[PDB]
Amino acid sequence: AEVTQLSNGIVVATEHNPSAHTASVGVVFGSGAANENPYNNGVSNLWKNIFLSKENSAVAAKEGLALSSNISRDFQSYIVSSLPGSTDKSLDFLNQSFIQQKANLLSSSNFEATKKSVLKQVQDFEDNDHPNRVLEHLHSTAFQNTPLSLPTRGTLESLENLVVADLESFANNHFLNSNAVVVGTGNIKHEDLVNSIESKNLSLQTGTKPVLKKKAAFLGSEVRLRDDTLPKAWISLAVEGEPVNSPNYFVAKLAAQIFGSYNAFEPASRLQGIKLLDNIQEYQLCDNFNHFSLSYKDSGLWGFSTATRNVTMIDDLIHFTLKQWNRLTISVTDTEVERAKSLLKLQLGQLYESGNPVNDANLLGAEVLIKGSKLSLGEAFKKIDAITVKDVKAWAGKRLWDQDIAIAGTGQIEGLLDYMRIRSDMSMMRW
Amino acid sequence: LTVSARDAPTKISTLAVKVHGGSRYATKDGVAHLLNRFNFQNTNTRSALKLVRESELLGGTFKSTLDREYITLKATFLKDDLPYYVNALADVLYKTAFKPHELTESVLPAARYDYAVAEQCPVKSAEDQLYAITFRKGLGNPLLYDGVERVSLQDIKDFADKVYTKENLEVSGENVVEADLKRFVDESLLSTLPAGKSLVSKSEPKFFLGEENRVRFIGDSVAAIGIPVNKASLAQYEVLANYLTSALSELSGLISSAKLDKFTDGGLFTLFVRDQDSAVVSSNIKKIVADLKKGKDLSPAINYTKLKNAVQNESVSSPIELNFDAVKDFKLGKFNYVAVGDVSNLPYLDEL
Amino acid sequence: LTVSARDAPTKISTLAVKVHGGSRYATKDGVAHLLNRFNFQNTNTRSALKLVRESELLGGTFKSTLDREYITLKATFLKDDLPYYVNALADVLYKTAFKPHELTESVLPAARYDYAVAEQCPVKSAEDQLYAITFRKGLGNPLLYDGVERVSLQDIKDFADKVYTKENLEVSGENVVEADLKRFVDESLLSTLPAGKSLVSKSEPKFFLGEENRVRFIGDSVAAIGIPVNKASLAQYEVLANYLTSALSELSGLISSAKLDKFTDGGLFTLFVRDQDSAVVSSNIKKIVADLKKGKDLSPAINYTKLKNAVQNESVSSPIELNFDAVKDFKLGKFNYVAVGDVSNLPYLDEL
Amino acid sequence: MAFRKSNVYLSLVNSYIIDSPQPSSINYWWNMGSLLGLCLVIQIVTGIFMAMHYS
Amino acid sequence: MAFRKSNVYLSLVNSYIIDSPQPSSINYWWNMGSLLGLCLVIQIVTGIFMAMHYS
Amino acid sequence: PQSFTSIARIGDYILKSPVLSKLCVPVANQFINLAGYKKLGLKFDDLIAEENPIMQTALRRLPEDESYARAYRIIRAHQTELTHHLLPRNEWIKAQEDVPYLLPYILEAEAAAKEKDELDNIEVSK
Amino acid sequence: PQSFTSIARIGDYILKSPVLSKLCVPVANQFINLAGYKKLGLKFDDLIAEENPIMQTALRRLPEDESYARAYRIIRAHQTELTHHLLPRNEWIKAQEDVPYLLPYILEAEAAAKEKDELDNIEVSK
């Protein structure tokens, strides 16, 4: 159990998994939505879709290859999956997609058709995916006029104004060697991959460095998208959280696990050791909720999202939740912290020990881009077990107690009270 | 009482107790679903509440899944806690309380939730329909409980007796040491369970062809075709499903979904065309059928399907298909058809 | 513009304006139902409220009825007030306001009610199904509006334009002096209506046989059979319907309902078996079909049918009268079948 | 629900002076009512205390 | 609805004194509360009228 | 209190009279501009007191698109009012946009209510 | 507010002891007969104050047929009380009929509630 990483101009990172019956090879760039501007916003999502374009997918399918691409805020990935014995065929495809060619996919017919498809996907997301649309607006308001505020899929306005030149322009500025990491996961040998890459010459294409921008900043604020025609109220609320590599990265995740997630329709979900559940189940304040600790390069967001049909009691839902958060600073119990440790280990285990090579490729690539390595699950578990009640209290005392919040909501949110009533609940009266 | 387990130096492990008690074996419409929902409720010695609270403390979660073939009780947890989870799953099969209040307060409401969700998805209704007209009683049984046929507490208990037997289940473990798993299973109440019969049928199921059923529904329209497939003919249908949903086929952009449901005694190929506009569904389905009837070469999709069939690593008792290296051509013969939605403006089987 | 009437020395008279705009002619699912519900709402010169208050003081009521073939506007009043009702009915066809608020506030809710009432009656569900699988698009159109196919205000107005024409309606009167009726009809706006074209098909409708549809439903189970009949075979199915429902048949206690729906271009014979117990429905339908395949002598039911057919008749537009004398035997050939309810435990067309 | 809403007495206080939905645009002229309540309290309290010494 | 239920003031009267659902079996001991209300009224009224002549 | 049927009757009479129209309309135009509701982004019909059956009937019948638009103007007007400012000149409602969008719904509701009252109190002359 | 779990624990201890049983049961029998609830057509379990979460859970779980019967006994008892009479002797609840039909539902709810409270306050000994 270990992760190897070598360099020679191109940084190669692999993670051999014997129990895997497939392999994934790809490139992860250290640039995402947070590297775009308001006007070209969605250009990365455009790249993802042309990579997954029918023409390109057909070539890959003929060789028994499957394509994957993920657009995030800090990173961007392009992965090719195949049987363990066809790892060579994956690299040949990857070489043709970035090095050998970089304008064949950008033909008028392919660009227009792809652009038309993403425009449809984004319009759909905006009209129908309320919980995710609300979470995207949380980022938009929390980090407004800052890089982290840009939605990963882009916006309809900027998307429809995008032309091939914008794609090429972005590719030239970000699809660079110094901003990339070739990853290999599943059944793969570090030596085989590093030698197959080193097999080809390609050395002249490099040297260039990506563009620099402004620093992400949190701003207490809110964006309300009331829609009385929707059957529920969907809201996300959060404070400034922890960036990746923060000394409190795990404490923040443990705190989120204390309140966790809930589904009113699942019998076992209603039996969880979460004190908040005693307050919200009596009058059934919501259908579901999920606490999170989103971490990025420059900042993060700690809070929760919830959906409810109880439109006349939203004030109680928010009040009880925030009152529980108050407890992290003054009265969180030893048992609550212990329960959270166990569940945090379980979530981390399921995230990192998945049987999916593409998931591992994304995780490996993203982590080696930020810290030049991937923290072992063993060392993560040890940090988690070391977290104390005092640690949680010190963290909440600086991050939660009487701190600004960002709020986003859509649907029947008339019952969601004004900003100050919510903001006041971030603390309690004391003597 | 089969026991298998693949090991790994991981920190997380999964345990699965697969019981041949899916909807195909349901004595009454929906009983398999209700039993699935009863799993993890109170046992004679431990309440559902204590199970959840205890499992959270040591770091583990439980779930019971229902499909046409099985009722799978799964546990995901920290590796070293294996014995606890083996006994927990065993206690469910051997001694669930089955209290009347649990049926009314938790089971029925949860099953209503599942139905309500599925009820709004026309493709799931179309799939249920496809199974019903192609197989009828048995494999064609409804997956979920919709209450058309009343199911009592006793019916649920009777089905548990009929399905929870040593000969009707397989224990599987991932990232688990087989030696220990076998030892723990032998010490658990699993071995104390009665050794009934394996409900698995060896012979091929009776099927029907050229069948059609139409269902009015408010929402998206769906036209679907179902084809019963032989045990030996299932490899060519697997490649067909992947081919039809890949960039290798010109009609992939016309189909919402296509797949092959595989069982030990055969399978069912299903293809769905879904859209809010009935005219679009009509044109798409007509084009798909006409194209498939003309036939096509599935050879180019061989290496691709091999990769896709392999991405199912989580499955332990997976049906091996070395038959891939023999598939080439496909020509659409007889099939079954179901229209759901704006039925008055959807094609009839006669027109295809 | 056919105008006929039968007089009598009574206090009460009835007036009907039969329009060939029933569900069989519905352009979109439920539009005939919606138009039927729109009748007697506001006209351009008189509100629905004034019409009601005015006719109450006079001593009369209005009603609009819908069936597979007609949309019938009927008035029942005190004899001497005939001209008022002639003009009232004429105003409806010529100048109903069709205000958007009337659709939302009165028409849609009223149609929603009609649907909910029928929705809980499985034989009516089975009957719609029988008409659907036998004739499809034409006479197979759903009787009521259920919302699967969106129907706008404009669609309703379009249907009115299509069906409210002089060549497409017949005016009837009972206990009314014909001479005066014709005069009032000519003076009314009924004569100013566009002389369109009769929608009545003179040829025989396309039909299907050996078709079946199964519908899951909570409540009583129902097994029904539908048989398309020619204009010539009409009389034999009339006596059959009455025979199977009379004390002359030893299977009348096994059937819930049996009838022959007569149209100018043919008809549909329907037989329904209904019960809360699906086992009873199964037994009965299987026996009914077995005995009908064995052949039956309908001769003894001839005089009974002449009596029953005579009582059923009242409208001045009844089908083929003298045709009964030649009926003799009957043997069930091909037919259509529908199962509604506990479908998983109901017979299939196969075993019939 | 919150105690201010469930309690029989506090629910009145809550409906009248805590959660009462007010039009966002009411101006300072809408402050006179609270002033009248204050006046009544001032009068009754000073009056009672003076009554103790009045003949 | 009836005015006694619709009107803002009458509704309270109706709620407490007219439509108030009473257990069918309460005996005469449950009449003391109304008597206490009567007593308070008697005291306040006689008191005020006497206050007019008191120093 | 004064019905819109009555306001229209008097108003139409002034409008259809070349003499009165030339004498009254200019005064009315200045009255409206001095009113200042358009400076808050409002149309006159947005100003009608709605707490009565006629107006509730009218507002319920108002098509969705216009209803959403009215909601926005009212909300924006409240926000502008509470800040003690007027909207920027370019956001003011133009005279061409100050249309009686609700009036026809109001007149229809009033006519129906008037007829119901008449029918409820009709006398029979035997 | 003494729990039924506590009551049963003490009572069972008395019933299981031949000495205490022969000494207490007779006095208890006399106490019950003097209580007179059976003369109003009531069973002891009908007398339990129900305005608490445990009792509401118990009553909700009580099977329908028994719930309807309990309802009748309560109504009939109120009617008899207001008329200041006792029921006819033949309608009195017989000793054999004075069964603890609700007790098992009550004990079950109390046990579950007790466990939840213990689990909500569990301490972890590392």
Ligand SMILES: CCCCCCCCCCC(=O)OC[C@H](COP(=O)(O)OC[C@H](O)COP(=O)(O)OC[C@@H](COC(=O)CC)OC(=O)CCC)OC(=O)CCCCCCCC
């Ligand atoms: C007199 C003996 C009885 C004593 C009782 C006194 C109680 C006060 C009565 C006065 C009153 O009700 O006036 C209301 C009138 C309406 O105002 P508006 O809602 O449109 O305000 C918008 C404001 O800028 C928001 O502004 P903001 O809230 O930010 O601060 C407002 C202002 C409020 O001052 C007051 O307390 C009221 C005068 O504070 C200041 O900036 C003052 C700096 C020293 O306020 C005004 O704007 C004044 C207009 C002339 C009224 C003259 C009074 C006739 C006698």
Ligand SMILES: CCCCCCCCCCC(=O)OC[C@H](COP(=O)(O)OC[C@H](O)COP(=O)(O)OC[C@@H](COC(=O)CC)OC(=O)CCC)OC(=O)CCCCCCCC
């Ligand atoms: C000085 C300050 C007090 C002055 C005002 C006090 C007035 C009321 C106080 C007495 C009281 O509340 O006693 C209630 C007690 C309960 O009775 P229950 O509900 O079980 O009745 C069934 C009844 O036959 C229904 O009978 P029914 O309604 O048909 O008529 C009842 C009777 C009522 O009389 C009264 O005024 C009430 C006491 O009318 C008559 O027929 C009497 C003919 C002269 O009635 C009794 O049986 C009295 C028990 C004596 C204890 C008194 C102790 C006081 C120190």
Ligand code: HEM
């Ligand atoms: C609605 C509230 C009240 C109003 C409007 C009111 C008004 C007045 C006025 C105008 C005077 C004459 C003040 C002067 O010129 O010296 C006065 C005097 C007095 N009031 Fe009140 N009053 C109120 C309530 C009360 C109450 C509740 C008491 C209780 C006994 C009270 C006790 C007195 C006394 C003792 C005086 C005489 C001393 C003095 O002149 O200030 N008042 N009140």
Ligand code: HEM
């Ligand atoms: C709950 C209400 C009241 C109670 C319990 C109460 C009680 C009493 C008592 C026990 C006395 C002495 C009676 C005696 O032995 O002579 C008294 C006297 C008096 N009370 Fe009250 N009282 C009440 C309300 C009032 C009110 C509201 C006033 C209004 C000012 C008032 C004015 C007087 C006066 C003037 C006297 C002196 C004359 C007398 O002795 O009767 N009382 N009260």
Ligand SMILES: CCCCCCCCCCCCCCC(=O)OCCCOP(=O)(O)OC[C@@H](O)COP(=O)(O)OCCCOC(C)=O
């Ligand atoms: C800015 C100022 C701040 C300074 C603070 C000092 C000012 C004090 C604030 C508290 C003011 C409350 C005054 C209103 C009041 O007591 O009347 C309540 C009438 C109840 O009527 P409702 O609002 O329709 O409520 C609901 C009730 O009608 C339902 O009936 P039920 O369940 O029987 O409950 C009934 C109340 C009964 O009491 C009365 C007398 O009404």
Ligand SMILES: CCCCCCCCCCCCCCC(=O)O[C@H](COC(=O)CCCCCCCCCCCC)COP(=O)(O)O
């Ligand atoms: C009879 C009625 C007449 C008066 C009408 C006017 C109403 C004014 C009442 C003021 C109550 C303010 C409470 C604030 C609160 O609870 O928020 C508390 C905070 O309170 C404070 O910080 C103290 C502010 C000082 C209050 C000044 C007292 C006013 C002097 C009395 C004048 C009236 C005689 C919750 O605060 P948080 O939202 O940040 O968590």
Ligand SMILES: CCCCCCCCCCCCCCC(=O)O[C@H](COC(=O)CCCCCCCCCCCC)COP(=O)(O)O
């Ligand atoms: C604050 C004081 C507390 C006292 C509580 C006592 C409550 C009794 C109040 C009596 C109101 C009766 C109203 C009946 C009614 O409206 O029904 C009216 C009929 O009223 C009558 O016939 C008159 C009855 C005369 C009762 C005398 C009143 C006694 C005054 C002394 C009470 C001092 C407190 C409707 O009757 P109907 O239902 O047959 O159509």
Ligand SMILES: CCCCCCCCCCCCCCCCCC(=O)O[C@H](COC(=O)CCCCCC)COP(=O)(O)OCCN
């Ligand atoms: C002219 C005035 C007429 C009065 C109009 C009524 C206006 C109400 C305004 C009063 C504000 C004061 C409320 C404080 C009390 C709230 C706490 C409470 O009710 O706790 C109570 C207990 O209260 C007591 O024991 C004494 C209350 C005496 C209050 C005397 C001022 C708890 O009540 P709980 O809601 O928890 O329900 C109990 C479970 N069955």
Ligand SMILES: CCCCCCCCCCCCCCCCCC(=O)O[C@H](COC(=O)CCCCCC)COP(=O)(O)OCCN
């Ligand atoms: C602690 C203080 C006392 C607590 C207050 C609550 C108890 C109130 C009991 C008083 C009984 C008296 C009620 C009579 C008033 C009912 C009629 C009414 O409200 O008509 C009112 C008009 O009232 C007035 O103009 C003056 C009322 C002054 C009353 C002075 C005592 C009509 O109101 P309306 O309900 O018809 O509103 C129309 C809804 N479409």
Ligand SMILES: CCCCCCCCCCCO[C@@H]1O[C@H](CO)[C@@H](O[C@H]2O[C@H](CO)[C@@H](O)[C@H](O)[C@H]2O)[C@H](O)[C@H]1O
């Ligand atoms: C009405 C007659 C006159 C009475 C006297 C006036 C009353 C004054 C009360 C003053 C302060 O009461 C005090 O208020 C502050 C908020 O301002 C509370 O603070 C609370 O919220 C603030 C945020 O706004 C947090 O920073 C703080 O950590 C938290 O404890 C504090 O815990 C409470 O103790």
